[PDB]
Structures are given as C-alpha cells and as structure tokens.
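User: Structure tokens for this complex, please. No commentary.
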Amino acid sequence: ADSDINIKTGTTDIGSNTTVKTGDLVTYDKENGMHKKVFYSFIDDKNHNKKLLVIRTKGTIAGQYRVYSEEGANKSGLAWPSAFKVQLQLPDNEVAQISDYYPRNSIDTKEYMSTLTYGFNSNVTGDDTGKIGGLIGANVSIGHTLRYVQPDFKTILESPTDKKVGWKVIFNNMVNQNWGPYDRDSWNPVYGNQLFMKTRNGSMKAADNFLDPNKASSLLSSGFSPDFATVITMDRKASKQQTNIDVIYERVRDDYQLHWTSTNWKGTNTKDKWTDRSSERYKIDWEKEEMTN
Amino acid sequence: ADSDINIKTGTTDIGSNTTVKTGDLVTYDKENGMHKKVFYSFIDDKNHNKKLLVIRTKGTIAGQYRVYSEEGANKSGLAWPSAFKVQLQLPDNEVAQISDYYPRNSIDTKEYMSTLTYGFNSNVTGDDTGKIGGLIGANVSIGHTLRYVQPDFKTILESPTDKKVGWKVIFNNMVNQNWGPYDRDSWNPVYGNQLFMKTRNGSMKAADNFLDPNKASSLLSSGFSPDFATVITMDRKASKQQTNIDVIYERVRDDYQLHWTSTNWKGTNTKDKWTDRSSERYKIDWEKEEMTN
Amino acid sequence: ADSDINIKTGTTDIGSNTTVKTGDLVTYDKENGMHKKVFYSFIDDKNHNKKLLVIRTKGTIAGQYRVYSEEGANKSGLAWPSAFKVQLQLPDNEVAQISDYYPRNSIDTKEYMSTLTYGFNSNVTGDDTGKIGGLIGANVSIGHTLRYVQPDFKTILESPTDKKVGWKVIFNNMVNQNWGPYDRDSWNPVYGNQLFMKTRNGSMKAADNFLDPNKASSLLSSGFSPDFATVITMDRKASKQQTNIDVIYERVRDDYQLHWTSTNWKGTNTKDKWTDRSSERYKIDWEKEEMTN
Amino acid sequence: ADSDINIKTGTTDIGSNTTVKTGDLVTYDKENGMHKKVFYSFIDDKNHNKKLLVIRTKGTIAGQYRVYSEEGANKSGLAWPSAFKVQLQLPDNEVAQISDYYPRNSIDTKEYMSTLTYGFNSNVTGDDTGKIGGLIGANVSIGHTLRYVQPDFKTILESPTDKKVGWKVIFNNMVNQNWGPYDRDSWNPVYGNQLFMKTRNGSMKAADNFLDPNKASSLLSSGFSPDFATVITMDRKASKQQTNIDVIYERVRDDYQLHWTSTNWKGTNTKDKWTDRSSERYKIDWEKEEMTN
Amino acid sequence: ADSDINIKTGTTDIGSNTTVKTGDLVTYDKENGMHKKVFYSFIDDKNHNKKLLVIRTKGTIAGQYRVYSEEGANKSGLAWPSAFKVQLQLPDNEVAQISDYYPRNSIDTKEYMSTLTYGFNSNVTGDDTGKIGGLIGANVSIGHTLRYVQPDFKTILESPTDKKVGWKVIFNNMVNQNWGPYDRDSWNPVYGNQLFMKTRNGSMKAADNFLDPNKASSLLSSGFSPDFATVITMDRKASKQQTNIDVIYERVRDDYQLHWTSTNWKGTNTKDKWTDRSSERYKIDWEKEEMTN
Amino acid sequence: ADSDINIKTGTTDIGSNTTVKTGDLVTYDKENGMHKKVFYSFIDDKNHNKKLLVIRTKGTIAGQYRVYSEEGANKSGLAWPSAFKVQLQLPDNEVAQISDYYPRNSIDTKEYMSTLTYGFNSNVTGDDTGKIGGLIGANVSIGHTLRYVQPDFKTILESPTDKKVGWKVIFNNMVNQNWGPYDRDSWNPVYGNQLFMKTRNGSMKAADNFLDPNKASSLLSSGFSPDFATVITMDRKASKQQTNIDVIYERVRDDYQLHWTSTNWKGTNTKDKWTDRSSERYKIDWEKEEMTN
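Assistant:
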C-alpha cells in the first residue's frame, strides 16, 4: 500500500478531478441461455498518459443441469456444466492494449500440524488365590495433519496477453450427500464415478437416480454470475480513435451416465462433451467516449 | 504508526497538495509469454527533499506447465515453473537511488502446544465360578504439537542495494491428490519424487500420467501476477535529469520426468533446467515527469 | 484512547495546521551489505512546547547465510545471522533529547487448558461352555495444556535513555523440515545441534549437507528490513540549533559447523562469532528544518 | 456508546472548537535506569465546566535482569523485576482533582466445556479348535474443560482517589523452556522454584545456570514502557491557578538464588528484595497552560 | 440500523447543529473508599420534543479485599466484595423522567455439539504351537458437548422505572490456582468452600492461608470502575426547571473464614455480611444547563 | 449493497437534505412493571413519495422471576417469564400503512463434520518359556459431528401485515449449574423437569430449592429491553392527516413447581399460566410532525 512507503493513501490512484462516462449494454442469448452484461467506464485523466476504459463483464451463464437422455429404465444421461469461461479479445491490428485485469491468480495456503506424544503406564492385578502380577509399558506416537480449503469451483485467470484476456471457473469437487468429495476423475471398481448418483442400488428408473439439483452446488443448475474487470489503455495521439472488442461467454458441459449393470448403479463421466459459445462484438469510440453493439 | 507517538495520522506522509503525474507502459513478450506492465507515478512534493518516482511492476508471467518430451510410452518429461523473478536495476553511473520497496520479508510464526495428562483406572472382574479379581493402574503422557502455515509459493524480497532491487516467488511445496506435501527434494526409494505423478502404477502412456494442471496450483499453468512497488529518489539539483532503468522478468523452469521402471512409475526432478529472461529498458525524464520505452 | 476519557479523537495529537518538512537519505554499505534509509520529518507545531524530528530507520540488512569454509569432504562451516541491530545515539553534549520510540516491548500471552474426565465401563463375557464372566471398571484423568505463539525472530526494544535508543531482532527458533523447533542452544548427544542439518547420515560433502536457504526463514538469507521510529525533541530557545546523530546498523553472525564423525553428521553452533557494524553520522539543522550526511 | 442511546457519535465528547496546548517533558534517571516522559495536553473548552489537563506517563523502566552475586561455583543470585509501578499524586492542599484515568481494570473471562459420552461395543472371538466366545460392553464418560488466557504480566489500576492515581504491572507467570508455567510461589521438594533455572542437574558454575534473557519475557531485561493517561480538572474560578504534581516511577526487584545440592540445582525466590523509586515534581500553570520541571 | 430500513445513517439521531453543555463532578468518599465521577451533558436540540441530560457514572469502587480478623493461628476471616452497585433515583415529585440507559441485559448464548461414531475392528492371533485365533468386533458411541463463556463478574441492569435506574456487577465464579471454578455456593464435605484457599493442608497461620490478591481477579482488591450511562428527559414547558437526583454507589462484602479443624483447612462463606453505601444529591438546572452538588 | 450493483453507497437511501422531527415518550406501568419508551422520528423527504414515521420501541419489561406460592416445606411454586412480546397495531380504518420493520427473521446455520479413519496394528508377545505369539489387526471408524449455537432467548418477528407488526422473545433453553440444557418440555421419570431445580435431593424447604436468579439468565429476573423499529408510511394527499396507533407490551409467565415426593425433588412446568398486558394509545399528527399520548 501507499502507507507502506510513506505516501498518503490514494496519492498514486487514477481518477482525481475527472469526469467518468459510464454505460451498460445488455444482451440475452436465448439459445445459449446466457445473460450478458457489459458495464463500461471511460476515464480521461489529464494527469495520466493514456485514455482508460474499464470493462466489467457481468451477467449470468445458466448451468443447465438437466437429464438429456434416457434409454429405457436401465440407462440415462445427465449433462452438467464443468466450466464457465469469459474472454475478451482485441484484433491484432488495434493499437489499444489490455493493461490490467481482476481477479488474478492467488497463492493457495495449507496448515501443517505435527504431533509427538510419549507415555508410560503400569498396573497391578490380583485375584482370590493370591495371584499377584504387574505390568509396566511405554508408548510413543508421531502424527501429521494437513488442513486446507477446497472450493466447489475454482476461478482462474488464464495467462493474458496485451490483446486478449480470459477467466475460467472450473468444477473442482463436490460433496454428495455427506460423502466424498467427488470430482470428474473419481473412480471405484464397483460404482464407477458417484459424482451425481442418488442411490447406489435403488430400484427405480435411471432418470430418477440423479442427485437433486437443490442438493448440489447452485452453480450447476441456476448458473454462475461473472464479475470480471479489465482495463484497456489507448494512446491519446493515435490516428484512429475507434476500437473493436470481442466478448465471448462459454459453457463446457460434461456427460454423466448411470447404468444398472445387474446389482448396483454405475456412473461414468465424459469430459467436455459439449461446448456452448456466445460471442459478441462491441465498438468503442474513444473520442465520443461511448461503447455500442 | 503516527498515533503511537502522539502524532496525527498521515502527518509525516508524502503527497499533500501535490500534483501527481501517472502513466502506464504495457509490453507483451511473445516468445517468453510475459505480459509486462509498468505503472509509474511522479511525485514532486515541495516539502520533500527529493523527487519521487513510484514504479509498480505488474502483469503476468505465464507458468507454461506442459509436457515437452515423450520417449515412447515408458518415458516422458514435464517442464514446470519453479520460480518467478522481477528485477529493477539502475546503471552504476546514475545519481538516482532506490529508496523504498514493497513487499518486504516478514517474520514467520508458529504455534506451540504442550500437553501433560495423567490418569488412574481400576476394575474388578468375576465369573460364575466365584473367581474374583481386580486391577489398579496408572498412566502418564506428554505431548507436543507444532502448527504453522505453508503457502504453495513464497514471495521473497532479495537483498536490495541503492541500484538494484528484486523479488522472487519460489515454489515451496504442493499437495498432490490429498497426499504430501511434496517439494522439489521429496524422495522415496520406490517412487522417487511424486510431485506431479498422477498414478503410482497406472497402465498408460507416460505423457498421460502427469497431474492435471487444474488439480495443481494455478500459478503452475496460468501463471503469476507480480504486484511489486519500488521508489526511486532523485536530487533536485542534479545536472542530468534523465535516468535509465532496466526491468527484468524471469521464469525458472524445472524438469520433471516419469519412467515406468518395471512395476511402478518413478519420478525425478531436475532443478533450474531452463531460464526464460525478458529485459526491458525505460527512460525517465524527471523534468518532463514521464517514462518511455 | 481519547474516547475512553470522553475526549474527541485526535484532540491531543500533534500536527494540526502545521507544515511538515520531510526528507529521505539513502546509503549503501557495500562491504557490510547494508541498505540504510533514513526518513525524517520536521514538525514545528506552534501549540507544542518543542520542535519535533521524527526519524524512521528503514532499508535492509542482508542476512548473508552462506557456507564460508570447507575442510575437505568431512568438515564445513556456515555463517548465519543470529541478530540484527539498529541504534540511534546523540552525543552527550547536545541538548536534544529522545522522547518517543516505536515499536516497544509487548506483554506475551499464553492460553491454558485444564481438563478433568471420569468414566465407568462394564462388560459381560461368555463362550461355548457356559462360562459367563463380567467386569466393571472406572477411570479418571487430569490433563493440562499450554498454547502460545513462537516467532522465528523476536523484535526487542533495548532499554532507551534520553541520548540513545536501540532495537534488536534476534533469532528465537526455527523448524527444520517439520522437525524441531531448534534454537542456538539445542543439543542431543548423537547429532549435536541440528539447526541447519539437511540429512542426519547422508553420504555427501559436508558443504552440501546444510539446509537450503529457501527452506529456512527468509530473514536468514535475503535479510531483514527495519521499520523503526524515534522522536527527538528540541527546545525552541536553545542557543545552538544544530545537532549530530549517529545511526548504527549491526549484524551478528553465528558459526554453524558440521562434521562427519564416524556414522552420522554432528552439528555445533558458536554464538556471536562475527559482528558487522555500519555507523553513519547525520547533521540536523533545526532552523533550516533539514538533515544531511 | 452514543449511538446506543439515539445520539450522534461524538456529541458528548470534549474538545470541539478548542485550541489544545500540548507539550512533552523528558528526564533520564541514570542511577535508576528510568526514561520518564510526560506528555501533557491543556484543554480549555468553553462548553465544559472545568479546565482539563491530560497527562500521559510514558517512557521505559529498565528491567535490569542480571546476576548480581556469585559465592563460588555452587551458589549465585539473580535480581529480576517483579513489578513496575507508576504513580501520580497531588498534594492535599490543592484544589485540582484527578477526574479520569486509563487503562482501568477489566473483567476476566473463561471458557467452560462439558462433555457427556456413552457407547456400546461387542465382539466375537474364536480359534481353530471351535471355541467360540463373545463379549458385550458399555461405557459412559463425563468431562470438564476450562480455557483462559494468562499474560506474562498483569496491568492493574490501583484504587484511585481524587488526589492520587496509580498503576502496577506485576509478574504473573512465565514459561521456562516449554515447561511450566512457573510463578513466584512455584515450589517442588526436589528443585524448589524453577522460574529461571536453565538446567536441572547441569555441571557448570551457578552463574551460568540462569535462564538466558532472550528466552524469557522481554520485560525482564529490556524493560516495560508505560502508556498511562490521567485527567486533572481545575475550577475556572479558583484563586490560585498553579498546581504541583508528583510523578513516581517504581521498580520492585525479587532475588532468585540457585544453589547446588549434592545431586542437583535448587532455586529459591525472595519477593520484594529491592525497590527503586524515581520521583519528580512538576509545576502546572493553568493560566499560562504549561507544565515545567 | 437505519441502513436496514433504507434510511441514511444517523438520520434519526439526536444532536445535529446543537450546542452541548458538558461538565464533570468529582467526589471522594474516604470512609467508603469510593471515587465518584459524574460526567453530564445537556443537549437542547430544537428538533427534539424534550430537553436531554446524559449522565455518565464513572470512577472506582475499591474492592477492599483484606483479612479483617484472626482468632489465633487456627482461625481467620476475609472480607471480599461480592457485588458493586450504582443507582440513580429521581424523587417522585419531579416531572423529569428516565428515558434511556446503557448497558442493558444481553441474551447469553452457548454452543452445542453432537457426535455419533461407529466402527468395526478385527484381528488374527497365533503362537508357536499353531494356535490360530481371530476376533471381530463393532462399537458405537454418542457424545454431547456444551461450550459457553463464564465471566468473573456479571454486569446486570436492574429493572428500571421512569424514576430510578440501577446496575449491579456481581461475582459469578473464579478460578483458584487452575482449580475450579468456585463460586459463593461451592461446597465439598472435606474442605467446604475453597474460593480463596491457598493450601488445603499447609501448616501456617490461618491469616497466611488466603489466596494472594495478585492471583485473583483485579476487581476484588483494586476495585471496579463503573461506566454507566442514563438519559433524563425534561419537558420544555414545565413550570419548574430544577431537578434533584440521587446517585448511590454500593459495595456488598461477603465474609470468608478458614478454620483448621484437625487435618486440613476448611472454608466457609457468608453472603452479604456488610454493605457500604455512599449517596450524593445533585441539583440540575435545566435553564442554566448546569449540574451542581 | 449499492456497491454490488455499481451504485455509490447511500445513493438510494432516504433522508438527504431533510429536517427530521424527533421525540420520545416515556411511560411506566407500575402494576405490570413495564418501562415503555417510544422514540419517534418524522421524515418528510421531498424526493420520497410518502411521509415516513420511524417508531422505535424501547424500555424494559421486568422478568419478575419470583417464588409466588409456598404450600409448606414440601411444595412451592415459581413464576417465571417465558415470553416477552411487543406489538404495534393500526386500526383498520386508517390509511397509514406499516412498510418496514427490524429486526427480521434470520436463517440459522449449522456446521457439519464427517470423519473416516482406518488403521492397522500388530504386536509380538513372548515369555521366559520360549513362547512366541503374534497378532495383526485392522480397524475402521466413521464419525459425524454437528455444531450450532443455541441462545437462551430467541427473537422472532411474527408475521406482519400492513396494519400490525409484532416481535416475541421466547425462552429457548438454559443451562442449570453446568447441566442441561433444559427447556420447558424437559422431562425425566425421576426428577421431572429440572429447569430451575437447585438440588436434586437437598433437605430444605421447597421455596429454598429454586435456582438463584444470579445463576440464571439475567432476562429472567432483571428483564428484557426491546430495541425494535417499525416504519409507517403516509400518503401526502390523504384527507385526514391524523393517525392512531396502539403499542402493546406483553409478558407471558410459566409456573414452575417443586414437590418433595418421598426421596427426591420433582419439578413440573406449566406453560402460559399468566399473561400481563400493557396497552397504550398514541396520536400521530403528520402535519404538525408530532406524537402524543
């Protein structure tokens, strides 16, 4: 922070005595089920060496957790969202550059505990016939413990360039009815993958043996709301003060299948079975300080 | 703090009634995969004895966690980022000096617990044959527990001078599928180093037996975003008011290899196999209060 | 606080409606490896009975954790920083006084647990040949637990006078590869002091058997950054308005030696083997409100 | 708080639209090793019914943890600070009164746990000879746990009057090399008081068998920094507007003796062996609003 | 809060653009050992329907934990403060009313934990003679745990009326040398009440067998500092604008006695043995906005 | 919050550039022992579509925990407050509506733990006669833990309409001398309900065998202080600008009886034995912006 280097708070921040031109653009992709919202802010600070445009991608990508196929009462398939992606791309001919982005990748931490215990004990025993006996013993034990937090979904900033930036929210693991956690690669020889299995050997249709979406993560069914921010810088002396930007929303869907075998349900997960893209082009007028579709 | 010495907060901070000249410079090194961003702030406070330039190094150094070699189905190699570095250097002939930097090295802490327990027990036993017996015993135990946090990556401020400052983010240790933690020096006679080994004896190609990047730290694949700050002071009466500064981004890559041996996979890590270096020179005009490439 | 005695916050603080003269002085001691930075603030508040100078000592004293001697493959020595010191001293003839300092010494706390448990148990036993047996028992246990935090380095304000003040950051203890903690006085008959031992009986050169600096505290190798503050008062009616002040940076280095003996490595530590001292004199002009070397 | 009774924050506080006259007085008692600092603030609020003087006692009383006597290699003594005291006294003839003080005495808290457990178990056993046996048992246990924090030193506000106020920081208990905690009244028949014993049966000089000051509380050697505040009210219509006040700094020192009995070391503590007082008189001028020595 | 009902913070609070008349009155009751302080604030807000007087009772009631009697070496008595009380009373003829008070009574909480565990175990045993035996067993256990905080003293707002308000700080329980907690009703057939016992069977004078005040709560010896607030409302159109108010400070003292019996000390507590009451009448002038003794 | 939707904090709140008319009305119901306080705030914001009146109900409903009947040395009854209620009601003919209220009902949470442990053990025996035995065993255990907070009293917003709103604070459960917790429905065959039993088989009068109020919740004896808020909206164009409002304070009292039976005390609780109701009518003048009784 500034106070760490003996500087008043907010001294080096941009946006003092500046008029900011804000706006919002809303689209709904009905076939992809994606509510896209772009909140833009034009900042022209005279003390800054470039024009700034802050773009916030918001809205909601619907999870679309649904049973899509059922081949009889012994087989059924479930499509579920394993990844949500948001990307912003500038064509290579533009002179505008991506300069900042949020959120970024954070360093994960774990808590380590080590224990060493040693003890002594002794006892004396007797009975009616005068049998008197004793015992003396010692023991030692060493233990190690690791503790860390596991989110249901991980938000990752994909390696950005000056022309494109992206974020992905990927499925990490989930708890299924207090069991687990299970992930896309969980496997046991008897039940296979139990990520969305409701009952292990219940007698019902396969389409009725999937985990109820209310018991799972809300991102799977109701969807994920991006809250990402990016900053685009433009030189004030550039000849062309018009820019094009592509904003892409993405949903990757895995395929979860349950089959009855002969005595118990067995689950199988197929990764990245489907991919739904929703791209949209925006025009940025730096002189007019506006953003249009 | 100031309030600790009966002084109003912010009294001794720099930047009151001062006009600050900010700017940002963005570069992308394509062959090194490094998005470099320099955010600078010129501060000329009339109550301060020197001119200040605050340089913030930001951007992203891509991790580039990837399988680079596969000699058949029994051998494969993986290159992974073990260290990220950011350096700022002033040539020895300049009169500008590095005066402050952030972050610095913090003192680590651990929590110690000591336990002493003692107890007594006794019982009486019997059967249908009139055999009556007893037992009296005592026990004592002493335990020691140590608790501390281990991050995946450590941020170290390398010993600064008045001409150069540097930071390095080094791999500390990682959890592999709830096992570990493993580091670059982990070794067991059977499996060697299991830092990125997916299965111990799985029957597949060696290139498919590496840990999935989504299951590892996001810094390994998507990369690390530096957020470092440095302060350069310049005398107001210096004859030459132009300075040169070098900003270097660096990525050290280790080589992780898996070989099948006869019955189980074995991992070997080679430290500092590769080093990607991206240097950039900047010109500082103190009179014009601006920095250029 | 002021609010605890029914007084508005900041009412009794110094620095209202005052112009503060700030400055920074940077030196690099190359042979001692010390980056010394003095941030000074002159405060002349008309409502205060004296002129104030706030001096903040900052910078970095390098740790210089390095192997310095190797006597063949069986003996080696390592020099490491056991203490860092910062001192400010006024000559006895001056009329300026040290009035305040930060940080000060804090009172350490620990958490105490006492547990008392008692219980009863009983069982019945039987077998094929009608042999019916029983048992009734009772037990009681008393436990005590102590929990407290141990930092790697302790920051201590040495007993100040009106002419000199000082701080020392001393090595407390360290964890060596999840073992320990070990301090400068740790000793066992087999291995001696295992403070920086890498392997107990590894077959390698002694210079290669020291703990890797990345696995130890960052203060040992990269060094320590002081953040100390002191306040000097000066009478407004003093005849001479010039002051001299000495600022001393110190690094005490211990000597850690490993020798192979016959079957296992043995470590020894020698306290305060070396002392690196960097003194520097400053001139304070109270009338000009400025500070020079 | 004011907001708890539907009143704006800070409405009832003193010091609005008031000019505050601050000052600091610094003394060093060399033979007592006491750096005394008085920070005073005169507040004359026209909306308040009295003139206020806020006096903050600060500085440092040196601990002076040192070995003072050594009668041969079998006996030695250590003097250590068991209490630090700060007192302010007004002569009985004054019309000024002590009005407020900080800190005050706080109510201590403890955490209580009660546990009730009951369980059943059963097993069947057999061998190759067809002997089949069973066992059924039950158990119940009751547990109680107490948790509280014990500081090394306790800060206590001694019962104030309108003429005198005082604080004492007294030694509570300390941890000796992960053992303890030990206090001034700790005693066992073999070793006596082990408060500052380094080794129980080490073969060395008695002067070398005391706990190293770096391993103990920093208040014992480097000393304690008072941060106490008191408020003195004065009637505006009083004839004499001059007051006298005494400020006393005190250090009570206990005597710890180690003597070598034929097989081991034995420690004995004598309470309040020495007392070091440092008194100072100050003159308060309410009309001139200044304090002098 | 106001923000919970879509209202700006502080909108409904009293004291905007108002001149507040503050004052303090200090008394010392020497024979009761009570430092009484009344901090008053007159608030006449034109937008409020009444005149407000905020009275804060502060100061210190000394604990007076002392041995008062010693009938030989086998009997002694200790007087200790079991309750501190502060009461404000308006005579029934006054038209002013008590409208608000602080602190109030809070709802206590506790943490409940329930655990259910079940397990299976099995083993096989053998010896030299080929005797091969096995065992299979199961177990189940249910546990309940209760956690809550017990303060040393409880602060309670006694049921207020429009004419009188009161607070009492009563002794709840105390830890005695890591034993307990003990309260005024603790009793065991051997030792009676061990509230302030130092040793159970120590051979010394009874007056020397009481707990050291430094090891007990600071409220018992140094005393309690009230911080209570009350608000009195007065109609602006009342004929008589003068009010009388009584402020009472109270200390209830229990009597703790130790007697030797024949083999061990026995303690007995008598509740409410003594009551020290200190009353004071104050005159409130609403027109002059002042408070006098 | 507003910042969550890219809107400045406090932008949508009511009360900017408005003059607020506040007042307080105090009543004491002596026969019901209820100190009722209504704090009202008239807000007429020109940018809001209605006139607002914020009414805060405060004061104290006394608990009145008392022994009311003694039928000898073997029978006694205790009356205790099981519920406190506060109600505000507008007559059905008014055009003013209740629009907001605080506090509301919150969603309770609990913490769930699942544990799975498995282990192996083995030992070898032996005696002086050359007998050599062995044993190998394995075990597995599954545990479930539930943790949540249980307050002594629960605050519940009863389902409001546009004409009436209400809150109730109901007894949830209590700890009796570290036992319990007990509620109004606790029952065991031997002792019945032990909610306020002091001793299970003490030989004293029944009136002396009730739990001491100091050891119970302070709400039971000293009483509960409501802090509720409600907002009433009024149309600016309404013909009649006068409203009537009823404010009701309620205390429900249960009856706890202890009877000796033959060998041990037995407790019985009767729910809602008594109800004390204190109603009071207020007149609201919207044009005058004032409130009267």
